[PDB]
Design a protein around this ligand. Structure first.
Ligand SMILES: Cc1cc2nc3c(=O)[nH]c(=O)nc-3n(C[C@H](O)[C@H](O)[C@H](O)COP(=O)(O)OP(=O)(O)OC[C@H]3O[C@@H](n4cnc5c(N)ncnc54)[C@H](O)[C@@H]3O)c2cc1C
Ligand SMILES: CCCCCCCS[C@@H]1O[C@H](CO)[C@@H](O)[C@H](O)[C@H]1O
Ligand SMILES: CCCCCCCS[C@@H]1O[C@H](CO)[C@@H](O)[C@H](O)[C@H]1O
Ligand SMILES: CCCCCCCS[C@@H]1O[C@H](CO)[C@@H](O)[C@H](O)[C@H]1O
Length: 257
């Protein structure tokens, strides 16, 4: 296990924070993949958990978007990490959220809830996403507006950037929604896709197997529901050894906080 130093930390809500760490020189990955990271307990025993790398493959530093679980073995400790302190990291990437598992197309959809946006914070910054596909749709559904902030600022930084912030316009479309707090756009991803509301709001044609591709990251129950909706539009689940129209990955184990 490689120990890496935290370079920056930002909290967002009472259950969410993000941090950046130095990257192991031996680490080579594809945007969307995850790695095991952790800390040592009081007895020096490692507490490891899977984390999507939230930074693109070209970033010289690694970024992570994390939940804070009450009494959670890892995050009850990780939430207190400070710049200069170190975390543990297994520089062996894995995961199913890789562009190599999708057939080239015109529109790439990122469907995520909560911290599930993590792998997409990486992919939205991955040049290949805008090369192998023409448009990227970021659908992020959370309970409140504060939970959407990390993603909002990231999207804003991309669309507002002097250099590419103009070259991204029209290519990266952001569709955030809340399921509880009043917001200009609300509703679950499954519902807005099934009712066609999202197609209407974005002014686009319905989802189809020929031009649309999707990546899903939320609870297991969310993944299962979303998969059904994607299939109801003709898309099929693919893999690295057989690219199709969509791939999914659990954002966590269990029901979620
Ligand atoms: C492939 C994969 C990728 C993951 N990527 C991330 C990531 O990028 N960021 C992140 O914060 N976590 C991610 N997780 C979850 C992560 O592995 C840990 O569960 C998390 O850090 C909590 O650890 P814990 O020891 O404190 O709590 P645990 O004992 O691990 O979890 C207790 C519980 O709290 C809920 N929980 C755990 N993680 C989350 C979460 N992220 N969102 C909502 N509820 C949760 C679940 O119900 C869970 O059973 C990922 C998990 C998998 C399997
Ligand atoms: C060459 C200018 C590129 C501008 C688009 C990215 C704006 S967002 C930018 O992304 C980087 C990549 O992970 C991070 O290191 C950085 O901290 C973050 O602010
Ligand atoms: C002895 C050098 C290698 C140990 C680093 C692995 C992370 S372990 C980790 O370290 C942080 C301090 O940097 C502490 O704040 C935290 O409580 C501890 O669990
Ligand atoms: C952090 C990276 C953000 C993405 C910047 C705008 C992508 S622009 C995009 O790029 C592709 C190659 O990558 C080309 O094939 C395509 O023709 C061009 O329009």
């Amino acid at each position: 296990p490689d120990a890496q130093t935290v370079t920056s930390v930002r909290h967002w809500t009472d259950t969410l924070f993000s941090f950046r760490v130095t990257r192991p020189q031996t680490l080579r990955f594809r945007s969307g993949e995850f790695v095991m990271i952790g800390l040592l307990d009081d007895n020096g025993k490692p507490i490891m958990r899977a984390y999507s790398i939230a930074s693109p493959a070209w970033d010289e530093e690694l970024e992570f978007y994390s939940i804070k679980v009450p009494d959670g073995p890892l995050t009850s400790r990780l939430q207190h990490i400070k710049v200069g302190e170190q975390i543990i990291l297994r520089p062996k990437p894995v995961g199913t959220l890789v562009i190599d598992a999708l057939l080239p197309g015109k529109r790439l959809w990122f469907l995520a809830t909560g911290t599930g946006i993590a792998p997409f914070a990486s992919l939205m910054r991955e040049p290949e996403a805008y090369e192998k596909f023409d448009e990227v749709i970021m659908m992020h559904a959370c309970r409140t507006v504060a939970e959407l902030e990390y993603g909002r600022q990231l999207v804003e930084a991309l669309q507002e950037d002097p250099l590419i912030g103009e070259l991204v316009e029209g290519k990266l479309k952001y569709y955030p929604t809340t399921t509880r707090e009043e917001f200009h756009h609300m509703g679950r991803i499954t519902d807005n896709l099934a009712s066609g509301k999202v197609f209407e709001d974005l002014g686009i044609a319905p989802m189809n197997p020929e031009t649309d591709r999707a990546m899903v990251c939320g609870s297991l129950a969310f993944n299962v529901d979303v998969m059904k909706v994607l299939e109801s539009y003709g898309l099929r689940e693919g893999a690295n050894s057989e690219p199709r129209e969509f791939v999914v990955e659990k954002a966590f184990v269990g029901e979620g906080i």
